[PDB]
Design a protein around this ligand. Structure first.
Ligand SMILES: [Zn+2]
Ligand SMILES: [Zn+2]
Ligand SMILES: [Zn+2]
Lengths: 499, 86, 250
């Protein structure tokens, strides 16, 4: 018909004849096409898909049903490929499955579907619903899975992946991350894991961490990775800070002989997810006091105006086991270092003695004693193996293992439910703060609002980070009411008023 | 005998400044500087002028002079340091 | 009557109907007076009551500073201010609701402005979102309480903004400068939306402080902010091969 209209009629009426032909041949039989849409999309007939797509794009109201069918098919495929996963390599399998589904459907859209923007948006919505697979009466496990995926790639391991493998795997991973809602949970989890990697030296390369932070900054914004870049900067400038400290102590007017080597990692307090919320007053062992006072003096001199809080639980040291004929040198934590120094004070020890020497809390001291007896560094001369007020032990003389260095306690992996619950509670607190900020800002912009409109606009505004549950908006509204910062109308709770 | 070596320590620095307090002395700006706190009998308690920069930060003249002898940057905010008042 | 009201302030609960009935009697008698139908109530009871609560809350404010720091003192004052709104509601005439609360503020927050403003620097600098929220409502009632927290918040933003855009990498100065001020503006518009009631008295202090950290001229130099922001638009409006979709650019 196009050929016949071209060879016969005026060029100004080419589109009218084709439009009338399509509105009497394709638009009239719309129900048949929409019925076959399900079969064509589900069984994925490429040529039939293209032939249907051309006509449904030509008709005014034929395309959206095919869009919905493709969205439902992609959602079903993603559920079928991302819910029946194992438990040994769940993050990598989840990410690779989402990448495979996304890649095959982008190839399908760009090849046999002309790369329509509507179908790409439908694919994005379907993958967003797939990755946000909220199991009923639970929480979404996707941000934790992506955080563990990032930790597994960026940690130094024996897999053998080079820098380029990390680079292009993370570049692909960004496509999965873009669909992930509840990005605050992922931000906090990745902040915790990045903190562990930077402090413990588990990072394979600082360049990979910087590239991943830059990728997240491009994907979400500078405000998303501001804390992450501050952490990376404070762990990169730490080498220069330690060099300056060494130059300070080597250029002191009075020569000081401190018998310890340092790798000090002074960090910003407002950026790192660490805390001194444990109420343990560890104080310090005897040998560390002089040099920690020297470093505090240096920091008061060369970086004035700031105080530093010592995270004693994240520190580590190397104790030379010169007691039983020097088997090896043990890499310990300062809690265990203080316990071993208290044992060095007198061969007999007690729970009361450790309590009055190291001044630690009872729970932390019991945990460190348990970790010491687990690595059989102690012999546990007392009869009972549980928590005890006796705690009598000198040392296990059989501990002469072959390795020159041992991690007598581990803190790299952990992932206890307590810390995950604390991270999610901090996420909820920041969510409530941001939600009430959005409430006040948008009702300052509007000054007249109802329930449904306010909920919809707050959901739309918060979508860059998370999907807000209506109960959280109600809770922050109640908080603002109790703190007399907002006053809704007394006639009804639906209408609202400014202040 | 348990000697200790190679202490890899981690600390959190936070901004702690008191109102009307010298950031280097960690005492009041109107009082004498920590260099002039010693030999207070010889000190006339007049040379400790309260220097202000363009960033509206108050320091002791001796402290900010000893600071500028090595670092040309203000300690409270990482900016090039000027003088505006006496 | 004041003794059975001071007993209520002491914790125990007297009869509300009896006290409110007697208090309403001082104004129900005057219901047939065309001119000044509350003069008897404002002289027999209210003037002794304001003097009584004036010398009680002043004694209460001095009794709270002995065992409480500024962080929890304002928590206790907000407890008394909230209770006094409740207490005078069920005990007094509605015409005396404002006079009692205003006189209570003149003894607990307005008489301790020197104490609150001295501790107002540590509250703003450490960004205590709970203590700054309680300090705001205390100083909002007093006429001259706010203009010191406004100045102290502006000093913090002028010092936080100067630290943020400082020692930026020479390669990416135009992009890092804009995002650093936007982070400071974005963070310090949240603290004046939740902690503070979107005050143009406070939001002008943010604007008055951010205009001094953007236009921070180096010594013996010229302000580089107009050059940096010009290069920031030029960086993103060029043909960006590193993604930069038109929706994300806008
Ligand atoms: Zn000084
Ligand atoms: Zn001096
Ligand atoms: Zn300064």
């Amino acid at each position: 018909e196009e050929i016949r209209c071209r060879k016969y009629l005026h060029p100004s009426s080419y589109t009218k004849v084709i439009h009338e032909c399509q509105q009497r041949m394709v638009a009239d039989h719309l129900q048949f096409l929409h019925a076959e849409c399900h079969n064509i999309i589900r069984q994925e007939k490429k040529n039939d898909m293209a032939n249907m797509y051309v006509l449904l794009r030509a008709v005014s109201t034929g395309l959206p049903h095919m869009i919905q069918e493709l969205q439902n098919h992609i959602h079903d495929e993603g559920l079928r490929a991302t819910s029946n996963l194992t438990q040994e390599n769940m993050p990598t399998l989840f990410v690779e499955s989402v990448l495979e589904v996304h890649g095959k459907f982008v190839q399908l859209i760009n090849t046999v579907l002309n790369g329509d923007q509507h179908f790409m948006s439908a694919l994005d919505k379907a993958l967003t619903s797939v990755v946000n697979y909220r199991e009923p009466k639970s929480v979404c496990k996707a941000p934790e899975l992506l955080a563990k995926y990032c930790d597994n790639l960026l940690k130094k391991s024996a897999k053998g992946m080079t820098e380029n493998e990390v680079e292009d795997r993370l570049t692909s991973f960004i496509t999965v991350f873009k669909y992930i809602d509840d990005k605050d949970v992922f931000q906090k989890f990745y902040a915790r894991m990045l903190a562990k990697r930077l402090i413990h030296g588990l990072s394979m390369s600082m360049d990979s961490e910087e590239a991943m932070i830059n990728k997240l900054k491009q994907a979400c914004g500078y405000e998303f990775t501001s804390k992450l870049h501050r952490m990376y900067t404070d762990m990169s400038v730490s080498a220069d800070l330690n060099n300056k400290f060494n130059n300070f102590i080597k250029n002191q007017d009075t020569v000081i002989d401190l018998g310890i080597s340092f790798q000090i990692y002074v960090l910003q307090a407002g950026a790192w997810p660490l805390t001194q919320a444990p109420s343990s007053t560890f104080a310090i062992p005897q040998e560390l006091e002089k040099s920690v006072q020297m470093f505090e003096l240096f920091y008061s001199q060369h970086f004035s105006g700031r105080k530093l809080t010592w995270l004693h639980y994240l520190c580590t040291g190397e104790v030379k086991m010169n007691y039983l004929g020097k088997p090896y040198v043990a890499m310990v934590t300062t809690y265990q270092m203080a316990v071993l120094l208290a044992f060095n004070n007198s061969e007999t020890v007690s729970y009361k003695e450790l309590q009055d020497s190291t001044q630690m809390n009872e729970k932390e001291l019991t945990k460190t004693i348990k970790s010491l007896l687990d690595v059989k560094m102690i012999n546990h001369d007392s009869e009972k193996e549980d928590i005890d007020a006796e705690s009598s032990f000198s040392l296990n003389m059989n501990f002469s293992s072959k390795r020159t260095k041992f991690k007598i306690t581990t803190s790299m992996q952990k992932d206890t439910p307590q810390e995950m619950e604390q991270t999610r509670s901090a996420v909820d607190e920041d969510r409530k703060m941001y939600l009430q900020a959005a409430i006040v800002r948008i009702m300052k912009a509007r000054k007249v609002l109802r329930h449904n409109a306010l909920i919809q606009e707050v959901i739309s505004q918060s979508r860059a980070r998370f999907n807000p549950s209506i109960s959280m908006i109600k809770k922050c509204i109640e908080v603002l009411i109790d703190k007399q910062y907002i006053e809704r109308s007394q006639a009804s709770a639906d209408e609202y008023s400014y202040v | 005998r348990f000697e200790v070596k190679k202490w890899n320590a981690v600390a959190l620095w936070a901004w702690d400044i008191v109102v009307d307090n010298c950031a280097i002395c960690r005492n009041h700006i109107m009082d004498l500087c920590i260099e002039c706190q010693a030999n207070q009998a010889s000190a006339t308690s007049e040379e400790c002028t309260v220097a202000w920069g363009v960033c509206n930060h108050a320091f002791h003249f001796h402290c900010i002079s000893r600071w500028l002898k090595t670092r040309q940057v203000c300690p409270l905010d990482n900016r090039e340091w000027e003088f505006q008042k006496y | 009557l004041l003794r059975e009201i001071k007993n209520d302030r002491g914790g125990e609960d007297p009869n509300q109907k009896v006290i409110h009935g007697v208090i309403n009697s001082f104004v129900h008698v005057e219901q047939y007076k065309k001119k000044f139908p509350l003069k008897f109530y404002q002289e027999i009871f209210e003037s002794p009551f304001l003097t009584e609560t004036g010398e009680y809350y002043k004694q209460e404010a001095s009794n709270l500073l002995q065992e409480s720091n500024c962080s929890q003192y304002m928590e206790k004052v907000l407890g008394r201010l909230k209770d006094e709104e409740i207490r005078c509601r069920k005990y007094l005439h509605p015409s005396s609701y404002t006079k009692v609360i205003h006189e209570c503020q003149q003894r607990m927050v307005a008489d301790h402005l020197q104490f609150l403003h001295a501790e107002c620097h540590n509250i703003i600098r450490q960004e205590k979102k709970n203590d700054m929220a309680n300090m705001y409502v205390l100083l909002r009632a007093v006429s001259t309480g706010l203009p010191h927290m406004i100045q102290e918040l502006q000093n913090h933003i002028h010092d936080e903004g100067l630290r943020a855009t400082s020692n930026l990498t020479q390669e990416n100065m135009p992009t890092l400068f804009v995002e650093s001020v936007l982070e400071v503006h974005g963070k310090f518009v949240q603290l004046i939306n939740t902690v503070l009631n979107g005050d143009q008295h406070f939001m002008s202090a943010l604007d008055k402080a951010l205009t001094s950290v953007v236009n921070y001229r180096e010594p013996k130099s010229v302000c580089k902010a107009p050059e940096l922001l010009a290069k920031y638009c030029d960086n993103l409006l060029k043909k960006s091969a590193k993604g930069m979709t038109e929706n994300e650019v806008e």
